[PDB]
């Protein structure tokens with residue numbers, strides 16, 4: 001049959017190939033091959049892994065199912081803190097924000113606009129391309145180490161394109177439909193339902209048994225790089241492209257707005273588009289695009305001065 005020498009090599013080929021399909025299907029939401037092509041190879045790999053468990057690696061797709069069970073979560077400090085967002089609620093709130101930015105900067109400023117995803121903020125640290133820590137925001141300077149649980153989030157890469165060392169932050173959420181499904185499953189089990197998708201997302205990520213988490217149907221959008229490493233983005237918009245480039249899920253709805261008035265267009269555009277989305281959002285995030293300018297404005301103690309969230313009512 002298959003020898004260890006042969007299986008060791010064949011396994012790499014399968015992880016490589018399978019991980020490629022999973023990337024397309026989970027990160028680009030656009031698969032290339034038919035499901036049964038995937039399953040065939042995935043079953044070949046499992047058979048190889050079951051015969052020689054020693055070839056099992058963290059970047060293998062068979063580990064997306066979890067199995068580990070923790071006692072509790074370890075503290076996960078953030079040397080670079082995970083800030084919060086200042087809030088706006090009116091057109092006045094947004095336009096006053098813009099007024100403040102031009103006052104301190106002394107010129108017109110371009111805004112990257114992103115949809116504020118209603119879920120759990122997460123931070124992801126990679127070294128030489130390997131995923132080594134996943135963390136909640138916690139209180140901004142200390143979160144919880146939820147690395148095991150995030151191994152089961154399919155859109156989170158166990159290994160990157162480039163062997164690059166970087167930490168990136170974004171949202172982990174449950175799409176509306178998985179929300180509904182989970183709640184029905186919970187009704188059937190006679191438990192309390194989750195009031196909303198962000199609560200489901202947050203309880204899922206606090207489950208100690210990673211095998212339950214795997215089943216939960218979670219997804220990510222990455223939007224900030226905390227530790228650039230060799231990374232080269234110089235504006236936020238640029239950063240969002242470069243996050244895709246190295247292989248994270250980014251939300252496609254982000255725009256680049258050269259005026260506050262366009263910013264108010266965007267907020268309206270997706271305020272009416274809000275229900276048409278598979279995921280829930282609780283507003284819009286407006287960011288000063290130029291990193292050089294985000295720097296100049298800098299940070300209050302809570303939230304950055306170069307950004308603000310327009311929250312829907």
Ligand SMILES: NC(=O)c1c(N)nc(OC2CCCC2)nc1O[C@@H]1CCC[C@@H]1O
Pocket residue numbers: 082083084085114115116117118121137171223224285304307
């Ligand atoms: N939820 C979001 O969609 C979102 C976003 N697209 N972009 C940011 O940029 C923050 C990062 C630190 C300074 C500004 N924050 C977001 O949500 C924050 C994360 C933690 C508190 C808010 O939920």
Ligand SMILES: NC(=O)c1ccc[n+]([C@@H]2O[C@H](COP(=O)(O)O)[C@@H](O)[C@H]2O)c1
Pocket residue numbers: 021022023024025026031032033034035036038039042061064154
């Ligand atoms: N490229 C693809 O078509 C592709 C990739 C990953 C998962 N899937 C599908 O997702 C389901 C679960 O697979 P995984 O738990 O290994 O991610 C399976 O039914 C599989 O067919 C399809």
